[PDB]
Design a binder for these strands. Structure first.
Ligand SMILES: [Mg+2]
Ligand SMILES: [Mg+2]
Ligand SMILES: [Mg+2]
Ligand SMILES: [Mg+2]
Ligand SMILES: [Mg+2]
Ligand SMILES: [Mg+2]
Ligand SMILES: [Mg+2]
Ligand SMILES: [Mg+2]
Ligand SMILES: [Mg+2]
Ligand SMILES: [Mg+2]
Ligand SMILES: [Mg+2]
Ligand SMILES: [Mg+2]
Ligand SMILES: [Mg+2]
Ligand SMILES: [Mg+2]
Ligand SMILES: [Mg+2]
Ligand SMILES: [Mg+2]
Ligand SMILES: [Mg+2]
Ligand SMILES: [Mg+2]
Ligand SMILES: [Mg+2]
Lengths: 207, 74, 61, 157, 259
RNA sequence: CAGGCAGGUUUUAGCCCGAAUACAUUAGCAUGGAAUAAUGGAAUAGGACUAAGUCCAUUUUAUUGGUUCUUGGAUUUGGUAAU
RNA sequence: AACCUGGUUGAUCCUGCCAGUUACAUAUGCUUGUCUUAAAUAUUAACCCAUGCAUGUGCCAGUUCAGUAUUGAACAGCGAAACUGCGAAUGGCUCAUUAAAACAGUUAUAGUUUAUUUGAUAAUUAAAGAUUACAUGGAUAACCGAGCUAAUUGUUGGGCUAAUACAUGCUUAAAAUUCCGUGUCCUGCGACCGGAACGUAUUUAUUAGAUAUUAGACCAAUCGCAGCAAUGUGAUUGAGAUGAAUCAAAGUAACUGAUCGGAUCGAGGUUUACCUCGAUAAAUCAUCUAAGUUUCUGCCCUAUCAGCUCUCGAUGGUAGUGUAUUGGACUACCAUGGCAGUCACGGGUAACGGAGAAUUAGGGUUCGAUUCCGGAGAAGGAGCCUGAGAAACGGCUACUACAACUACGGUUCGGCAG
């Protein structure tokens, strides 16, 4: 009965505070649920594991214990595909969560560019594989291929950081979902303000 | 309709006109059968039940009914 | 399981001074004038007269 | 680089625009969360053109204000964006038919927008519990001068 | 507390039921329905103590359980010892084709108004909330916990509708604004009926309202307690105890014993 | 005591009438207010009202600019007032 | 009835107390004819307990091949068991704990959960799979029969058949929108053509929701309304709700698929094609009900209690956990605060708080275990199953102290503050 009643505290004026009530059941406090990753099945066969907990109203709440694949969205483009997350880096909350590759709502991680690479290719005619072969278009320029241009000319100035990411195969993104609460793990792809920044934490972190 | 009166009036008002009859002491025994039954498996239970002081409602009706047919007048 | 709800009320009124020479004299002269039985009765009456004047004063206010 | 990192590990907004804004390369991109609690309250100029990321603000967050609204003098400036306001009232004493003085202390949250100072009158609103004590946010600040002891100061404000 | 209450005490059951103090110890507890606990009249009360059609407790048990259906509430059959008949309702006693209004006194006691097959058709509904829901559709809701689909758009949140029960059709509504007639569903002033004077909103969380009536008395109550009994002076239903207006204890005496 | 009933069969398969009211201080809400009491406004100066000029900010103008403009705020000046 | 009188002297006039006087609570002594009404192991032990009862329940409408009655040849009256479903978390007793804690009067829930009720709402069953929907599949109580123990509403073990139990599952709308094909025409990512996605919910990211408080003007560009273009026109229709929303409703992208989208049940009618009124299961929004947590204000003695809280939280900030949700409620990192003579912190209370109770010129004094309400608890203490709902306790687990049976192996539906 790990409770959370604010009684076992000390009122403003730090004087101990009285109790007449045994711990009451609605102050429930469930066992924490650290969330790891299977981006290393060196031991861990069963890729992802999610256990459902019977919550109050009568509903179920799925709890993420072990995972390997989540869903992520590229802010800029409005694209979202399910991908395989790689390694967790910098958890902010604490560095131990990174050491155990645990999944906090706001844990910054890596993903496979594959789905985004695949897409950025189909909609713009730009693979993002090593720079030289850059574009891959059609043979004749009379029909609908005229659009991959129109979009491509949209000065798709995807930050020098977004570019490097793709080619390296790794992609930076933060999460936005309580695994211990919904069982999933969804995140947005890192960019501008935070990208530049979180990276800094990483550059200086190792150096 | 005495046929309405017979359906509405209380079981106690009927024994009063000497139409329904007796009011035997249920309490004690019913409390004692609870005793046994609560401690048996269906097998015997059924049997026991075939011994709980009479006066079914099904019984109350047949008796109510008899006053129905057998009576007519005014 | 006893939970009465009817109401109490005492019709009596005990006097402060238990042996007022002058007061007792009136109570008796009264009991004999009205064929009363016990001093109680006499107080029962005074107590009633009370409710009236206490309500008269209350209203004169 | 300052308002963003400054120790803490990130500071976005409720309306996660940002980096995506680079998509609307012509109009105004520098959006910040804008709001108006209303209830006859003006929304601080400073609140809008600020770089501050205070989730516990009543103009920069999905923090509501409901019912109880307060006016009280300020006691301390310490604490991170939290202040203690002291209210001064009289209490009646049934028997003696007179009063005595009394003071309740209140934990108030202060969005960066308005600038504090010790010993000034402040207006708090009733916002959801933000912490053990906090349950009030500042909405309107009036600067005032008290030459010295804030404790000595007692005004039926 | 253990869980959720489930009974009700003689002593604790509303003065609106004009209940028997000596009675028993309990009292039929209203069933979770269209109207709130305090603002309601469970059938058992409605027939036993009210109409007096029933009497002993089992008397009801017959009436509402009998395969004949003797009680109707707003054109529907009911067989629950304590269905919470609320304000501005219409109850029909099948076996006699009786039609009643569930309305409060002027002294705040639940009164039964007898209606003609005519009014028995329409029932007055007050508007709870108003917002648009699923697939671009508008919904309105009445105190009577009615949920309305595609309602006339000229209807503000604090409105009052006239309902044709027979066709489950609306007709002639009327919001609350300076210059209407109203009934107050609850308060130190319930059962009154007057002309709305003006509605001062204070937003801080509680708006108020004023009123006038027959002898031109000044009334004050919170909006939530105003029910628009009609638009511009003409009331929409026949009121109990003459007109919705109460007398000084002084006016009652002079009217009755003429002092 | 007290219950909240009861009153008239001489309209009796129905009639008449009731279950009212007041007090509830202390803290909160709406609101009328002229006394006492506390508190406050223009004194470094600056204030006030007014006109124009300038700068910052901005609603409706389809929307984005650029002007203008309404609307807030900042100043400078000049006028007005028993400053 | 705003009253008082005896006692300090050899007498006297004073403060002053003791005493009397009075009411009321339990106790108790003596004495008792009526009628009406009636509290009643609280105090001292919230101390212990034999015994019996104190919670069960079935319709016309979830399963009847029990039994009756010789009954629609599938089954139709009555009607037990047993599987099903609800209930058992209401009440009832008690006050030991408990002084801003609980309570009350107030307020919040834009920080939340609510089975049963009342109103309304659903055209699309997801992919892979698989496929009957005139409708699928497998197993088990009751029963038959074998058995164990000294023992209990213990239960092994073999054979038999039904469900609203369990398990699995079939169901063509169009338009629109978005995207794709090196498809035509044309250049507007425009038009026609063809292909793909498309319910709801879940989980994120993003677009727009035009604070109808808030007037207008000119040139350019885009935009949309006519539109081949020309040239225009027009800026209009618009805007549910609130004091206020990162509200309601909605567009795009993808995720999960353990959300839902009825393989069920009556009865009354009637020459057909069926018809009419119901039961019940169950999703979301309301609604009712109730519950968490919450704002502000108010408590008895006491400093022979003055400094208190802070090694782990004490006050605030950050990120996460966790919860029904808010929150240091818990983790990590960071700041050092938070309270106090307008009595903190600590201690006492034969202290559960109110509504109220006794006497009262006025003001007061003293009580409130005890029918209403709220709280707490069930031998002490912690833990939990289940459920919409309790840390329940007339449910379970272990410990401490105990109660009952024993063939001493083991057992108890063992907790009377009902
Ligand atoms: Mg549910
Ligand atoms: Mg019986
Ligand atoms: Mg002074
Ligand atoms: Mg009921
Ligand atoms: Mg409100
Ligand atoms: Mg002397
Ligand atoms: Mg002497
Ligand atoms: Mg001498
Ligand atoms: Mg004395
Ligand atoms: Mg408090
Ligand atoms: Mg078997
Ligand atoms: Mg097509
Ligand atoms: Mg048939
Ligand atoms: Mg947080
Ligand atoms: Mg203490
Ligand atoms: Mg006390
Ligand atoms: Mg109680
Ligand atoms: Mg409460
Ligand atoms: Mg006993």
């Amino acid at each position: 009965g790990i409770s959370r009643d604010s009684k076992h505290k000390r009122r403003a004026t730090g004087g101990r505070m009285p109790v007449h009530r045994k711990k009451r059941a609605f102050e429930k406090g469930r066992p924490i649920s650290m969330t790891k990753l299977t981006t290393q099945s060196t031991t861990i066969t069963e890729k992802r594991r999610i256990r459902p907990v019977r919550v109050r109203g009568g509903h179920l709440k799925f709890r993420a214990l072990r995972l390997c694949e989540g869903n992520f969205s590229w802010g800029s483009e409005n694209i979202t595909r399910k991908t395989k997350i790689l390694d967790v880096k910098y958890n902010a909350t604490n560095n131990e969560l990174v050491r155990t590759k645990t999944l906090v709502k706001n844990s910054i991680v890596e993903i496979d560019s594959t789905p985004f690479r695949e897409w950025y290719k189909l909609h713009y005619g730009i693979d993002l594989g090593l720079k030289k072969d850059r574009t891959v278009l059609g043979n004749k320029e009379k029909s609908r291929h005229v659009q991959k241009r129109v979009k491509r000319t949209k000065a798709q100035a995807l930050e020098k950081n977004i570019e490097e990411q793709f080619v390296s195969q790794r992609i930076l993104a933060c999460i936005t979902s309580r695994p211990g609460q919904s069982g999933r793990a969804d995140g947005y792809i890192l960019e501008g303000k935070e990208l530049e920044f979180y990276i800094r934490k990483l550059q200086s972190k190792k150096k | 309709n005495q046929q309405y009166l017979l359906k509405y009036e209380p079981n106690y008002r009927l024994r009063k006109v000497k139409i329904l009859g007796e009011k035997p002491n249920t309490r004690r025994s019913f409390k004692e059968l609870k005793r046994k039954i609560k401690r048996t498996s269906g097998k015997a239970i059924t049997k026991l039940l075939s011994e709980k002081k009479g006066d079914t409602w099904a019984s109350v009706q047949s008796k109510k009914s008899d006053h129905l047919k057998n009576f007519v007048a005014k | 399981m006893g939970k009465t709800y009817i109401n109490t009320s005492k019709t009596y009124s005990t006097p402060r001074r238990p042996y007022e020479k002058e007061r007792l004299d009136n109570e008796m002269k009264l009991i004999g004038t009205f064929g009363l039985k016990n001093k109680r009765e006499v107080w029962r009456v005074q107590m009633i007269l009370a409710k009236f004047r206490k309500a008269a004063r209350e209203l004169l206010t | 680089m300052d308002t963003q990192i400054q120790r803490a590990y990130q500071k976005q907004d409720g309306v996660f625009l940002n980096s995506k804004k680079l998509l609307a390369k012509k109009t105004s991109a520098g959006v910040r969360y804008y709001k108006n609690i209303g209830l006859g309250f003006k929304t601080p100029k400073e609140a809008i053109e600020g770089t501050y990321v205070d989730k516990k603000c009543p103009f920069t967050s999905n923090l509501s204000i409901r019912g109880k609204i307060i006016k009280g003098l300020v006691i301390s400036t310490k604490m991170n964006r939290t202040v203690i306001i002291r209210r001064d009232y009289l209490h009646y004493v049934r028997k003696y038919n007179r009063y005595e003085k009394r003071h309740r202390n209140i934990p108030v949250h202060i969005s960066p927008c308005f600038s504090v100072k010790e010993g000034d009158i402040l207006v708090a609103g009733q916002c959801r519990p933000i912490s053990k004590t906090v349950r009030f946010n500042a909405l309107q600040v009036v600067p005032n001068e008290i030459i010295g002891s804030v404790r000595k100061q007692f005004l039926l404000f | 507390a253990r869980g959720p209450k489930k009974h009700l005490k003689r002593i604790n059951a509303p003065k609106s039921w004009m209940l028997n103090k000596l009675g028993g110890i309990w009292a039929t507890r209203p069933s979770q329905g269209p109207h709130k606990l305090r603002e309601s009249l469970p059938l058992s009360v409605l027939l036993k103590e009210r109409l007096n059609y029933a009497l002993n407790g089992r008397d009801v048990t017959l009436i509402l359980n009998d395969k004949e259906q003797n009680v109707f509430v707003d054109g529907k059959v009911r067989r629950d010892k304590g269905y919470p008949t609320g304000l501005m309702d219409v109850v029909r006693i099948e076996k006699t084709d009786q039609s009643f209004r569930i309305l409060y006194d002027t002294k705040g006691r639940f009164v039964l108004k007898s209606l003609s097959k005519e009014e028995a058709k329409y029932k007055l509904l007050k508007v709870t909330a108003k917002a648009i829901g699923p697939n671009q559709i508008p919904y309105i809701v009445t105190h009577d916990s009615r949920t309305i689909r595609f309602p006339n758009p000229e209807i503000k949140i604090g409105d009052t509708l006239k309902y044709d029960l027979v066709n489950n059709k609306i007709e002639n509504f009327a919001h609350l604004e300076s210059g209407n007639v109203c009934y107050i569903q609850q308060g130190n002033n319930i059962g009154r009926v007057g002309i709305i004077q003006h509605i001062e909103k204070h937003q801080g969380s509680f708006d108020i309202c004023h009123v006038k009536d027959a002898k031109g008395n000044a009334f004050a109550t919170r909006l939530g307690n105003i029910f628009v009994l009609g638009q511009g002076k003409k009331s929409w239903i026949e009121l109990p105890s003459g007109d919705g207006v109460r007398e000084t204890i002084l006016e009652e005496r002079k009217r009755k014993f003429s002092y």
